[PDB]
From a paper:
Here, we demonstrate that the centriolar protein SAS-6 forms rod-shaped homodimers that interact through their N-terminal domains to form oligomers. Proteins of the SAS-6 family comprise an N-terminal domain with the evolutionarily conserved PISA motif, followed by a segment with a predicted coiled coil and a less-conserved C-terminal region predicted to be disordered. Furthermore and in conclusion, because these residues are well conserved among SAS-6 orthologs, we propose that the self-assembly of SAS-6 homodimers into a 9-fold symmetric ring structure is a fundamental property at the root of the universal 9-fold symmetry of centrioles.
To investigate the structural organization of the Bld12p N-terminal domains in the context of the two-stranded parallel coiled coil, we produced a fragment in which the crN variant was extended by the first six heptad repeats of the Bld12p coiled coil (crN-6HR). AUC experiments conducted at 150 μM protein concentration revealed that crN-6HR forms higher-order oligomeric species. However, a mutant in which F145 was substituted for glutamate (crN-6HR[F145E]) formed only dimers, as revealed by AUC and MALS experiments. We solved the structure of Bld12p crN-6HR[F145E] to 3.0 Å resolution by X-ray crystallography. The asymmetric unit of the crystal revealed a dimer (denoted the crCC-dimer hereafter). Dimerization is brought about by interactions between the two α3 helices, which establish a parallel, two-stranded coiled coil through knobs-into-hole packing of the residues occupying the heptad a and d core positions. The relative orientation of the two N-terminal domains is maintained by predominantly hydrophobic interactions formed between residues of their β3-β4 loops and residues from both coiled-coil α3 helices. Having the structures of both the crN-dimer and the crCC-dimer of Bld12p allowed us to build a structural model of higher-order oligomers using both dimer interfaces. Strikingly, when crCC-dimers were associated such that their N-terminal domains interact as observed in the crN-dimer, we obtained a ring with a 9-fold symmetry (see Experimental Procedures for full description of the modeling). In this structural model, the long axes of the coiled-coil domains are in plane with and radiate out from the ring, which is ∼3.5 × 5 nm in thickness and ∼23 nm in mean diameter.
Author numbering:
A (entry chain B): 15 to 216
B (entry chain A): 16 to 221
The structure:
Amino acid sequence: GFDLSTATTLFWRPVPVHVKQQDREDVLEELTFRILTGVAKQNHNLRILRIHISSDSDLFFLHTLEVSEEDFQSLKNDQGILVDFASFPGKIISLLEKCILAQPGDSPRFQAVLTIRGGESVFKIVEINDEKQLPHITLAFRPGNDSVVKQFLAFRLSEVKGTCHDLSDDLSRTRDDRDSMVAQLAQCRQQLAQLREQYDKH
Amino acid sequence: FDLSTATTLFWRPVPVHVKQQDREDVLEELTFRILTGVAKQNHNLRILRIHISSDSDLFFLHTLEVSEEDFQSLKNDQGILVDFASFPGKIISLLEKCILAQPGDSPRFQAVLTIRGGESVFKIVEINDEKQLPHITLAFRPGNDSVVKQFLAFRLSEVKGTCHDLSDDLSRTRDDRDSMVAQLAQCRQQLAQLREQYDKHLLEVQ
């Protein structure tokens, strides 16, 4: 399937989403959106796009979408999506960018909506002009399950563990440099105090 | 089991001899973490939990969990002289022995994890030439999808946190480094200016 190793992040930012769940109350949450593009393990010629909706506050919350260069004609059909596969992530980004920048008094107002109906969920980005609500994109996401959330958290962990390692390396290098500057400052202060004595010389 | 009020008593990699049914024997370095706390349901019930994981296989997990109550069965089915409070200490010293063991040693302390599928047995053995004498033998359950999920979410928030702290120190360190360079440059300026004031004043007084 999809190899999160050879993957490329195109977008990875929190977006203000209106989450609507089945027997729970409507809530405005800030959810993380990551748009990934790569290939299939089985066939290195099959391009795939992956989208993840997660929360930094709920580490178990996850919603996923996955479409190959092939199956894109199915998704494109029924939706009316004018754009091709290569163009698709760009259409998604600009729309999520509009939602990010939306301000209270706005009209037309761009709003992201995630409707959770048990084992399936629908993500839409809508343009709200007073009464009328016009959708720019409507997508089909699958929530959970235990096996998928498990793999995601293992990916996230190795990822954070890695950026942690890099931070540690810079801190070492920075601390080493700071220590060298103090030695140089002390030597300069010594030269300065010695020159002052050499000034007397009376 | 309260993971909020929990306490880590041990947390280190130990060299373990992993034996699996249908696979070849392997010497791996596995992470051991010993925690003690209480039950969510009853704040009066003391519990001990031990996790065996790998930094190389993020899905590998084997767990052991015993409450102050359940200890007596574990104690009888073993001959363990020590009480519940004393038990983690017995485990630690044995894990230290395995950690410090060197190749040519005899008596040599060795950690062994046997996987039969659905169940796994962890033992710490003393090897004096031929004879192998076990000091501890424990029953571990390999983690399922739901248990591995919770573990990785715990690990992630934990690393995400120590990552934040590292970032803060790097900011503070970088700020200090930048200030030292400014101080060094100012000192070098003062030094060059004094030199001109000296040179001139000595030429002038002639």
